[PDB]
């Protein structure tokens, strides 16, 4: 398990040295950010109608009078760039607020917890996360338990012993296609169906599927060598 | 999930057939690309959304031919064969309850077709019905549907042997209930109120967009070859501004508002993506995340810029 | 040898789950998988 | 006692009640102590 995560926590410097583009979703905030300054800069360059973009080539040349007439175009035009400007940033901030409020989540039912919430930290059964720094962002690296090698079994939902159906404690039953077990679900190791691995209700008579095999009652065994041990007793007993 | 894609000619809608226009047009130097931007920046997350919701499965998995569940009858949720696109029963149902130029405007496709969010549905519900939670968090394991609901029954923290001794009942409780989950659909109207709602709004606004045209915004008139027949070249370009300067602020408006309705079903199909991760693919301890009751488990359904989930519960 | 093709895209390699109502597989094993998680 | 587990006596607790609690043991040993009885008393003969 050590090896494993040593070996899968490898693979991740690995993949950050190695490609270009893994912070895809960071660098575009960054782009977004810059294309927007860039975009603002670029409408001082336009007339909107006035004589010129530079407002020292109006005054230096209109009057007052002929001059507002064309400082006006381009105060109306900036204006509505800066507005512009202001409203694709506030509809893009709510964008990166929704993800900051996303990742103080996964800060706090990942880094600070272990999720049983299906796909939030993960693709597996989340086991523990650790948060990573980066520019205007974070980067949460989630370890997760992945089930690997699989075998078919048989299986049935409760045994039939005395009349009486059992039915697992925890685990589930299988077999190999002769001999019966009582396993974990999430892993395969097999254990004998005793008393102490399943429960009883009702009797074999109203579980659809039930199997018919023996369940194990470990107080049999040290109560019948305690016969045994009565038994000889009683022999060495028919000497005197 | 998603809305219309859409983009427009910035150049067509202020100024079709009209080089004059197009030639003022020019003093706004980006007034127009940026607003292109914003509709691609839209329309490039519609295909986003889809797929946060629906691509979450590996593999394409298919239900056996054989139906021993036990009981439980999905047919009426499961692929129907005898059809041009695999739709089920419902999703059939729920794709005809909701109802569906020459401005430079034009409506995009999605880049997965009808049969493509169809076949992702068709996948996760075989995979529920197969594997249970398995199949997402690792390779899709097979076990029994009632013994894989006895599973669903401890998570509720109710004994398996209950689920064993009702199995029939419990069969009989899914099928009724997914019986009256298709009359429900068929008989009343507003049901897909949501749906029916976005496809409204794009319908409302593209609408607006249009009629803004015949607008004068204190011009002379609406139409370009009356003012550049009836005016001179220095007076003429006036009222060709005029439109330009209201027209402009009537994409503005729109694209404005496209970013706002976005932003909400962006937020839409992300808790959708996150009902078919911890609904679908797994099983929930959240209160009223996946319905009223205890939530056991729940199948996704298909619908037009939509999914619906069939929340199943212990109550 | 190169161009520019186009085609229908895939959904996901076909898989057909081998459900039996009395078969259920296993994991005699399992991996521990780190992924990595980028947030604005 | 299967269904059941203990923790400090019964003073402590607000509202608890008095009722018998069954040890599947106790019987499994007093069906071996008649097993036991009856093997005793067949040895009286010899
Ligand atoms: C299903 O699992 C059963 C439990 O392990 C297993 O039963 C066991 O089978 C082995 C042999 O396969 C028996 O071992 C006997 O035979 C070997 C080979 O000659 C020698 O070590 C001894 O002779 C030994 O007695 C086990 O005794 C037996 N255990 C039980 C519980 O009876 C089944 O074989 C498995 N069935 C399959 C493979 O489907
Ligand atoms: C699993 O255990 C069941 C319980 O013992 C067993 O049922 C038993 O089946 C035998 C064989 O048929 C019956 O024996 C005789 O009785 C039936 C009527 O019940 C008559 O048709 C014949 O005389 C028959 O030989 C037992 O009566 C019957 N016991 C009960 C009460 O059900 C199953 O057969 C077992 N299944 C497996 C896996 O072998
Ligand atoms: C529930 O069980 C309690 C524990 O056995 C029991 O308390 C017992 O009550 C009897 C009757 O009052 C006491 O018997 C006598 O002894 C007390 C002093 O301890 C004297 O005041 C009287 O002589 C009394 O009759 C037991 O001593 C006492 N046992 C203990 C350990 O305190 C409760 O009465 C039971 N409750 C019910 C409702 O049955
Ligand atoms: C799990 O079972 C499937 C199908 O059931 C088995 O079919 C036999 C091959 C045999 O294993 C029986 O005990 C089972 O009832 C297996 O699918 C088979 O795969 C092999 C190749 O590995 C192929 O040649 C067979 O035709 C397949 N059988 C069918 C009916 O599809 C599958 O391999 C098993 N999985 C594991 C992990 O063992
Ligand atoms: C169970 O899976 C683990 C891997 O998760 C296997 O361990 C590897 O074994 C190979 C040799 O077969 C080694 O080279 C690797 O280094 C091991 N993994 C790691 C990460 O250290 C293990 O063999 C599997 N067991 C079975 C029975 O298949
Ligand atoms: C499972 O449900 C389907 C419906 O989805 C049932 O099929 C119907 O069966 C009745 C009775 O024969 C017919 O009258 C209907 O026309 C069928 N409808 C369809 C759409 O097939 C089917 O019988 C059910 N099976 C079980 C397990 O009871
Ligand atoms: C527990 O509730 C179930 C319903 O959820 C009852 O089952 C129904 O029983 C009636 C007869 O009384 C049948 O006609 C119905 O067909 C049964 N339901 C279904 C869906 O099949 C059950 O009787 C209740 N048990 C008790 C003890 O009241
Ligand atoms: C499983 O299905 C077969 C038919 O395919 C049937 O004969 C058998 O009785 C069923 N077993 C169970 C678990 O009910
Ligand atoms: C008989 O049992 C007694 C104990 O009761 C022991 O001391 C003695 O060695 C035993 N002898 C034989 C022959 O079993
Ligand atoms: C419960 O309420 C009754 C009065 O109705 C009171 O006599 C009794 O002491 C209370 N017991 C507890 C456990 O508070
Ligand atoms: C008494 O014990 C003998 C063996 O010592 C046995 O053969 C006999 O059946 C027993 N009789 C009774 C009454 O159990």
């Not at chain 1, 926590?9 to 950050?16: H, R, V």
């Not at chain 1, 993800?99 to 693709?123: H, I, P, Y």
């Not at chain 1, 190999?176 to 008393?195: A, C, K, L, M, S």
């Not at chain 2, 970013?259 to 693919?281: F, P, Q």
């Given at each position: 398990?050590?090896?494993?995560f040593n070996s899968?926590?490898?693979?991740?410097?690995?993949?950050?040295?190695?490609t270009?583009?893994?912070?895809?979703?960071?660098q575009?905030?960054?782009?977004?950010?810059?294309?927007?300054?860039?975009?603002?800069?670029?409408?001082?360059?336009?007339?909107?109608?006035?004589?010129?973009?530079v407002?020292?080539?109006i005054?230096?040349?209109?009057?007052?009078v002929?001059?507002?007439?064309?400082?006006d175009?381009?105060?109306?035009?900036?204006?509505?760039?800066?507005?512009?400007?202001?409203?694709?940033?506030?509809?893009?901030?709510?964008?990166?607020?929704?993800?900051?409020?996303?990742?103080?989540?996964?800060?706090?039912?990942?880094?600070?917890?272990?999720?049983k919430?299906?796909?939030?930290?993960?693709?597996?059964?989340?086991?523990?996360?650790?948060?990573?720094?980066?520019?205007?962002?974070?980067?949460?690296?989630?370890?997760?338990?992945?089930?690997?090698?699989?075998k078919?079994?048989?299986?049935?939902?409760?045994?039939?012993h005395d009349?009486?159906?059992?039915?697992?404690?925890?685990?589930?039953?299988?077999?190999?296609?002769?001999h019966?077990?009582?396993?974990?679900?999430?892993?395969?190791?097999?254990?004998?169906?005793?008393?102490?691995?399943?429960?009883?209700?009702?009797?074999?008579?109203?579980?659809?599927?039930?199997?018919?095999?023996?369940?194990?009652?470990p107080?049999?065994?040290e109560?019948?060598?305690?016969?045994?041990?009565?038994?000889?007793?009683?022999?060495?007993?028919?000497?005197? | 999930?998603?809305?219309?894609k859409?983009?427009?000619?910035?150049?067509?809608?202020?100024?079709?057939?009209?080089?004059?226009?197009?030639?003022?047009?020019?003093?706004?130097?980006?007034?127009?690309?940026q607003?292109?931007?914003?509709?691609?920046?839209?329309?490039?997350?519609?295909?986003?959304?889809?797929?946060?919701?629906?691509?979450?499965?590996?593999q394409?998995?298919?239900?056996?031919?054989?139906?021993?569940?036990?009981?439980?009858?999905?047919?009426?949720?499961?692929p129907?064969?005898s059809?041009?696109?695999?739709?089920?029963?419902?999703?059939?149902?729920?794709?005809?309850?909701?109802?569906?130029?020459?401005?430079?405007?034009?409506?995009?496709?999605?880049?997965?077709?009808?049969?493509?969010?169809?076949?992702?549905?068709?996948?996760?519900?075989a995979?529920?019905?197969?594997?249970?939670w398995?199949?997402?968090?690792?390779?899709?394991?097979?076990?029994?549907?009632?013994?894989?609901?006895?599973?669903?029954?401890?998570?509720?923290?109710?004994?398996?042997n209950?689920?064993?001794?009702?199995?029939?009942?419990?069969?009989?409780?899914?099928?009724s209930?997914?019986?009256?989950?298709q009359?429900?659909?068929?008989?009343?109207?507003?049901?897909?109120?949501?749906?029916?709602?976005?496809?409204?709004?794009?319908?409302?606004?593209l609408?607006?967009?249009?009629?803004?045209?015949?607008?004068?915004?204190?011009?002379?008139?609406?139409?370009?070859?009356?003012?550049?027949?009836?005016?001179?070249?220095?007076?003429?370009?006036?009222?060709?501004?005029?439109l330009?300067?209201?027209?402009?602020?009537?994409?503005?408006?729109?694209?404005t508002?496209?970013?706002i309705?976005?932003?909400?079903?962006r937020?839409?199909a992300?808790?959708?993506?996150?009902?078919?991760?911890?609904?679908?693919?797994?099983?929930?301890?959240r209160?009223?995340?996946?319905?009223?009751?205890?939530?056991?488990?729940?199948?996704?359904?298909?619908?037009?810029?939509?999914?619906?989930?069939?929340?199943?519960?212990?109550? | 040898?190169?161009?520019?093709?186009?085609?229908?895209?895939?959904?996901?390699?076909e898989?057909?789950?081998?459900?039996?109502?009395?078969?259920?597989?296993?994991?005699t094993?399992?991996?521990?998988?780190?992924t990595?998680?980028?947030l604005?």
């Amino acid at each position: 398990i050590a090896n494993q995560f040593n070996s899968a926590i490898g693979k991740i410097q690995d993949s950050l040295s190695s490609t270009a583009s893994a912070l895809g979703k960071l660098q575009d905030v960054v782009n977004q950010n810059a294309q927007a300054l860039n975009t603002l800069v670029k409408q001082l360059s336009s007339n909107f109608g006035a004589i010129s973009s530079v407002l020292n080539d109006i005054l230096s040349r209109l009057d007052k009078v002929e001059a507002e007439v064309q400082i006006d175009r381009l105060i109306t035009g900036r204006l509505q760039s800066l507005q512009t400007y202001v409203t694709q940033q506030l509809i893009r901030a709510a964008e990166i607020r929704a993800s900051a409020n996303l990742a103080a989540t996964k800060m706090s039912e990942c880094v600070l917890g272990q999720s049983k919430r299906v796909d939030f930290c993960g693709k597996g059964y989340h086991l523990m996360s650790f948060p990573q720094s980066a520019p205007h962002g974070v980067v949460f690296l989630h370890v997760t338990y992945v089930p690997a090698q699989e075998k078919n079994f048989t299986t049935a939902p409760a045994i039939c012993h005395d009349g009486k159906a059992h039915f697992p404690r925890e685990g589930v039953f299988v077999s190999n296609g002769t001999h019966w077990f009582v396993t974990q679900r999430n892993f395969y190791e097999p254990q004998i169906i005793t008393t102490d691995n399943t429960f009883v209700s009702g009797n074999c008579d109203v579980v659809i599927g039930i199997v018919n095999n023996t369940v194990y009652d470990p107080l049999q065994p040290e109560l019948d060598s305690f016969k045994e041990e009565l038994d000889k007793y009683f022999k060495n007993h028919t000497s005197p | 999930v998603s809305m219309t894609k859409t983009s427009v000619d910035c150049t067509m809608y202020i100024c079709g057939d009209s080089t004059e226009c197009s030639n003022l047009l020019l003093q706004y130097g980006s007034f127009c690309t940026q607003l292109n931007r914003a509709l691609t920046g839209i329309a490039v997350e519609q295909d986003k959304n889809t797929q946060e919701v629906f691509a979450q499965v590996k593999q394409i998995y298919k239900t056996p031919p054989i139906k021993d569940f036990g009981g439980f009858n999905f047919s009426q949720i499961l692929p129907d064969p005898s059809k041009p696109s695999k739709r089920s029963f419902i999703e059939d149902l729920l794709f005809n309850k909701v109802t569906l130029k020459f401005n430079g405007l034009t409506v995009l496709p999605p880049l997965l077709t009808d049969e493509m969010i169809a076949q992702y549905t068709s996948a996760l519900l075989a995979g529920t019905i197969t594997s249970g939670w398995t199949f997402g968090a690792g390779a899709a394991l097979q076990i029994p549907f009632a013994m894989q609901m006895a599973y669903r029954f401890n998570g509720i923290g109710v004994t398996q042997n209950v689920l064993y001794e009702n199995q029939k009942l419990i069969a009989n409780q899914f099928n009724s209930a997914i019986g009256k989950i298709q009359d429900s659909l068929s008989s009343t109207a507003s049901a897909l109120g949501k749906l029916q709602d976005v496809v409204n709004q794009n319908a409302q606004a593209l609408n607006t967009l249009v009629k803004q045209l015949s607008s004068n915004f204190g011009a002379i008139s609406s139409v370009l070859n009356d003012i550049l027949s009836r005016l001179d070249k220095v007076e003429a370009e006036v009222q060709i501004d005029r439109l330009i300067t209201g027209r402009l602020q009537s994409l503005q408006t729109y694209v404005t508002q496209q970013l706002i309705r976005a932003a909400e079903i962006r937020a839409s199909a992300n808790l959708a993506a996150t009902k078919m991760s911890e609904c679908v693919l797994g099983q929930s301890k959240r209160v009223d995340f996946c319905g009223k009751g205890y939530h056991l488990m729940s199948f996704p359904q298909s619908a037009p810029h939509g999914v619906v989930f069939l929340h199943v519960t212990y109550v | 040898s190169q161009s520019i093709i186009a085609y229908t895209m895939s959904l996901g390699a076909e898989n057909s789950v081998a459900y039996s109502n009395n078969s259920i597989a296993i994991p005699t094993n399992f991996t521990i998988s780190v992924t990595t998680e980028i947030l604005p």
